[PDB]
Design an enzyme around this catalytic site. Structure first.
Site, short mmCIF file in Angstrom:
data_model
loop_
_atom_site.label_atom_id
_atom_site.label_comp_id
_atom_site.label_asym_id
_atom_site.label_seq_id
_atom_site.Cartn_x
_atom_site.Cartn_y
_atom_site.Cartn_z
N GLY F 58 19.06 37.32 61.40
CA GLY F 58 18.40 38.48 60.83
C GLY F 58 18.42 38.43 59.32
N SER F 87 18.58 30.90 62.80
CA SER F 87 18.55 31.49 61.45
C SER F 87 19.95 31.57 60.82
CB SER F 87 17.79 32.84 61.50
OG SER F 87 18.20 33.74 60.49
N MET F 88 20.48 32.78 60.60
CA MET F 88 21.84 32.93 60.07
C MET F 88 22.90 32.51 61.08
SD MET F 88 21.61 33.93 56.84
CE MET F 88 23.39 33.73 56.86
N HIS F 112 16.15 26.58 60.94
CA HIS F 112 15.11 27.28 60.17
C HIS F 112 15.47 28.73 59.88
CE1 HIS F 112 11.21 28.61 58.74
NE2 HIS F 112 11.18 29.54 59.69
N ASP F 150 9.98 24.86 62.33
CA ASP F 150 10.69 25.37 63.52
C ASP F 150 11.34 24.22 64.30
OD1 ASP F 150 10.01 28.23 63.27
OD2 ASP F 150 7.97 27.64 63.84
#
Lengths: 172, 175, 181, 177, 171, 171, 170, 171, 177, 181, 172
Positions: F58, F87-88, F112, F150
């Protein structure tokens, strides 16, 4: 918000349609794609040998709809000259790219993008066809397209002309 | 839908009346609907007469860059010179379309607000579009790019007077 | 907004929307979801075109993901029982009732543009019973009739979400020609 | 707003087909959709009291009072109202279909015909003796005894066109041309 | 949606040419005001020809609806009433207030004299006026009307004819 | 929801030094993890924390606050990926203690980081790439290459890549 | 929702004088901090409070009630930063005890405060810049320039600017 | 709502005391993470006793759901699976991944191996891994599994037992 | 939040009645409401495998898969599950009622019992042979032939408690005390 | 928010919400609309009170405009067939199922406070038939039984929206006593 | 937003309930009216001879609900002393007015209003009962009440005491 013209009462797009000008403005979908096909079929019927001017400002949209328009451009008798007047991303770039050879334009500040996003499984495949179609019209190797699309290779108007998406920038 | 003589109805309204006199409005947010309308009107007025000037009255707070710059370019590359008149507010793309008017014919009414800051709108590197904007704002205003880049960073607000001296407009209609 | 075309025709200097103008060439469009609203516009137009001439062909441009089975049946039935041949032409998608409508066109006059996609999945879509879905068998026979395919083949592939490019639909029998010029 | 239109606000396809005395009922029967049929039936009667009317029905039914208004208007006016089922005729839809002129009630072959009439009718108690005029009307046009109609209107029975011909709800099944 | 006639007239406009007016759906200021406009218009066109007021309504606003009733009364031409479907509350009153001998219903219609809630409590001597109106036009005793309105008396075309709400059932 | 002694199920597992991040990384979810990490530091700073991660990522702001808090406390933060680490989540998983980063075999890991998280102020992007590189044992040159697309990964590839140390295939 | 100890996880950290501002500064979030600060002061007025901040800021009125409560109470309010500190988050970070304002390296500090939070009465914005100038050590004309500008600063720059004392790296 | 037991325990907490866990409703990060927490908790309490995993699910998220599958696998105690109602998509996979000889269904349950949409197109070699998992645990040929998943094969308790998705139907 | 409660979060009336092995199904059968019954039935089984369970049913029915889960759980567990209808048992509600222990299926006298099971069940086609296990289950507990059950489960038939006793859906009608 | 009462009872220093506390005196409340949620809370409580003692009276305080006929029937039936007398006490309104619940209390133990209002209108409130409303006759007999009134009188007054003050309900037979001290 | 107290855990209203304090705050309806009746019945049960303090801030609401509370105050054994701590309009004034003789209070700035607004036909009647009840407790002529209510005769705390709605203003 759309004005009206004389010569009979006409909305402006309808007036511009008489000079063989078609617009795609905003997202590609069953509504907006089917209206372009409708105008293209109509303009061919009026005169099958007069060029059509297809002005494109689109972030793309649905592939089924957009490929409906793309096919129609290739298979009507008239040459569909494609001008980009703002943006041409996703299907917007493909419809731009698929204009009549030598008659594909963009205004200088526009942004051409060739990545086709997310919007049964093995069925892409479709994506292979989009890459093969983009390779035909640009002249790039299929490999070049496949590497460059699964990445949003963003391009200004002059960069798109080098790449083969358009033929001419409009500086005049 | 305005005061109408007789969306896409059958009527001759006030904006259709003034389009007969080559006058064109950008009122409100710049986007795909509104930008394409200007561009449609500009293409129409050109085919009617390629030599007569167009009067493009502007009251926008701005909006989309892609669509906005699409109008800017059309103003530049149609034969007819486009006069610009700011009738309330010209921010972001409004100020660029205003400032992009033909040389010598860029007007603003006395009380209008011109703001030249531009906000955003995968990618990150992709916002060298902000450099294309800075060049064009420098080209029309006459200012230096180091000025335009720095001055177009913070939310700079101008009354018509300051917009003349800065170079975003050529006159202020006191008469 | 829909564009507007002005014409003449020994009758007056008439004004049409873009679709009514193409209706003069016997071009009907089904665009988007098959429901009561859209299926009756199609059926209305087919009856109108028959009333004008019962022997000139009709060109039915289909770009639909499908929808209501009863509403689409009306259209499919209307296509079979008006006197003029309904040529079908797929210009994007034809899934579910759309692929039945595409395949229900006149023998040898069903077309698709090359990049179109065709799925023959027949999904579930006031109150009535499960055994009462012997509407499903009628769809499967309607498709088996029009495709030249064995009924067992249609029953196997309809509960499979079996996607096809244009030329594959030609092979399967859903259309007659892909359009290449 | 309206759909495939000539102008001189506009002259849609339903209008163009109304010049040919063709009338549709499309979607659920309610005060708006039912009065439209009634107003067309009256207009067509006033244009020409003697030429037939062609009523193309695609409906799940709906409001009984509204639909009975349509039903009644069809018997009231001078013209023979031919009924054609073009998808669904259910509840009021099946009644309207079945209430067309003797020998002029058609159905397309894939159509589904359902004589079951459910609640709501509209305060409502034994004053759903509306249900008894429903069944008398359905009995008269079909030729079925009132027993069978009461039996079959209270169970969700589904008929294809050929069972509907057999039962008397329609006179013909369009299997040609 | 409403079909069009060329001679662009909507179908209700075209039936207005034959002095036919509709109350369809709920009675409210908008719908009531519309009916009043048409009754006014038709009289100025010709004050001596009948008007044919087709009614499919479940009633609604009393003020609005009595406005329609009063206009029917006090205009010159007879307003003949014909019930097609439902006539409840202000619909059954408006049906019942048509010209004498010229109030009709199609035989499957449903007619209901009961009138619900739609100021002060003492200001439902409006209720008294409605029941007088209904009594006058039906021929019934006010006592009967008041019994049958507080009850939800539901009548078919024949029962409504027998009650005096309408003069004829037509086939 | 569920309760036990020897306290919800998550509170009970917090006694065994177990922490979950589950779903989107936001100001709410990040702070609970940071609060849990802090509480576990003060309770016993030598012992190990076991941090379970099933998230599509997020916010970068909220996410990097958790990253720092993992590094700059006493305990080793052992990471396990139990479904998704995008992500994170990829970064928090990659940022576990040296030699103590795991993943369950069917887990999908995606380095990514999308745009959500103005202009050149996305030099944060270079701190991420550096943070990844440092923990991955991979060059800034390929790290930027992969985060510009991606790029999905299984637990086997993620290990070979550097993002995790062990894929759990036993007891 | 939130775990449990022995207390809930935030209350247990309040047992060690830790306080969180998480997300937006508004009447609700700001009053919780303000009540926690008062409680910690009443438990022990000398010991340091640790105030972790992760906020994009928010309401000026509510956020200035908490900034004043930091100064007015006896306990030194140590402000740590754990991700973001924009608008009031920047002010509340800067307003910590001199010698005891900390950050984590990846954090993102932004002195800019928005429009939303009488027209002349937004002389309040000049009080804002005075207070920043006081806690940073910068001249006032540097602050008013920098605020109105979207000038994003990471922990090492925020140290140079005066917005913070330390940057934590162990 | 959930009733309470005194000994205040909610009913699912009280059944957790007997090593009983539920997946009820859609599989998603929240629900999947919950199940994982319970399986972890129960092992730390006792790694040698069976766990009884009751499943009424129509499936859902693949990442989340495979996280649950992997935890069932790699924890020490046997997780016995029992289908009560529906086991579709990730539910039928989770049912089928229970310990060998200890996978149950009640006789009226409905079991469906089909798994729909819920990145990239090439990253549905996740689909390949699911079909391997299903093949391994059922004993079926991958070709059969792949046929029956793209089709919406609906099985009752007996059919699922014959297919190898479960080891016993119980009365 | 919850309703008439002792505390030491709270110990509501349904909990207090669960100490007495009384379980309710109130409102429509769905994944949430059905698993609650299943979890209670399992908890009561684990507390004491031999003492009876009293299942008070007020439901219009709902989800077939969810409800069959409840139905199955009642036969699976060791305890006799007594069923009492306390308002409505319709579709799955009537099945659950009828699936109580032999001789221990009650109904209050004003209750309405409706064995009609409508769509939706949940992809769905002939795989609504769920409908055939429904009817076998209903046949087994009632003693009715499978013919009559198929006949009566597809028509919206309504029974008061005495018709439900007659038909075999319940063993007793509570007419006293 | 609901207030909380702490007590002792040779068992513990227990804590109740205000309604659970009054449940110790065998006081059940029906407050507002009769639906599935509220009718099962009432029925639950009645069973609980019977389980505690089947001979001590129950005091059922009613303030409802009515609602679902099936749900209210459950309550009405539960009131008749548990062993203890359910005394009813109307403390505001009792319309529809509420007036049936009020009137369904034990002989000579139905009360109302003076200012309460009682309406015996039985309105219309999955799919089933009109003749299948012989639920309406059961209501009318249930009311005719409990009021001492002729069945014809109940049929006349139930489709009338016949409102009554407390003492009028006493006269009609819906209650036994109005409470005046 | 409601705090908690010790002496055992208690919300503040629950704590104040132990000292025989009941609140009505905001609109009168089936929820808020039934909770007052519940507390009143409870306090009578604890001690039938100890006064109860009923604090009222209400714009009124439903008459059926409010008259439920009003009746309960008259017919429980304890004296319900009524304090107005903000407003007492519509049913708020009637419940205030119906407190135990000599124990009806208001704070000085409060606003007592006696008009009963809109919220079968002949059924009011009920309104006659509200006027007869207000006349008993105030001592005014029925005529005086009927004239004064079909008009929102607004009153401050001292004006209400003159009128007989309350017995004492609290200036101490």
């Amino acid at each position: 918000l759309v004005p009206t013209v004389i010569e009979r009462a006409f909305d402006i797009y309808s007036r511009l349609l008489k000079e063989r000008i078609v617009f795609l403005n905003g997202e590609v979908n069953d509504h907006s794609a089917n209206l372009v096909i409708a105008q293209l079929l109509f303009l061919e019927s009026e005169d099958p040998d007069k060029d059509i001017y297809f002005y494109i400002n689109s972030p793309g949209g649905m592939v089924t709809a957009g490929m409906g328009v793309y096919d129609t451009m290739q298979f009507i008798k008239p040459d569909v000259s494609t001008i980009c007047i703002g943006l041409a991303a996703s299907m917007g770039s493909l419809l731009l790219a698929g204009g009549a050879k030598g008659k594909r334009y963009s205004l200088p500040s526009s942004q051409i993008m060739i990545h086709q996003p997310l919007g049964a499984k093995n069925i892409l495949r479709i994506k292979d066809r989009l890459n093969k179609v983009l390779a035909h019209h640009t002249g790039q190797d299929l490999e070049t397209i496949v590497k460059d699309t699964d990445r949003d290779n963003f391009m200004m108007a002059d960069e798109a002309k080098a790449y083969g998406l358009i033929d001419h920038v409009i500086e005049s």
